Design a protein around this ligand. Sequence first.
Ligand SMILES: [Zn+2]
Ligand SMILES: [Zn+2]
Length: 121
Amino acid sequence: GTRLRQRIDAAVAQFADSGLRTSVQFVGPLSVVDSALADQAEAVVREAVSNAVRHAKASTLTVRVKVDDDLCIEVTDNGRGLPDEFTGSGLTNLRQRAEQAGGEFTLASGTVLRWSAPLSQ
Ligand SMILES: [Zn+2]
Ligand SMILES: [Zn+2]
């Protein structure tokens, strides 16, 4: 197997700033995701979490990985006041991986990062 769930947990544990509260949620049959897509999911979470910094107030960073019609990752950051957060080279990385996977990516503003890709049929 891909150990996708364990790898998402490890990515959050390694890269989440200790000043941020985190929540990690999984929904759906993670075991159906193939190796290439699991690698993308891990890299997306690593990149998104490593770019999250401390805000003036206490903040929460939520990571949701869902397998439904597709694979979709939603990283929500309720922190405010940092318009340059998430706008670095990591954004190029996330967009590049979405194109690599034939999927899509959205940055919306707290701030929500959504990365999705189709599952192979
Ligand atoms: Zn933040
Ligand atoms: Zn989905």
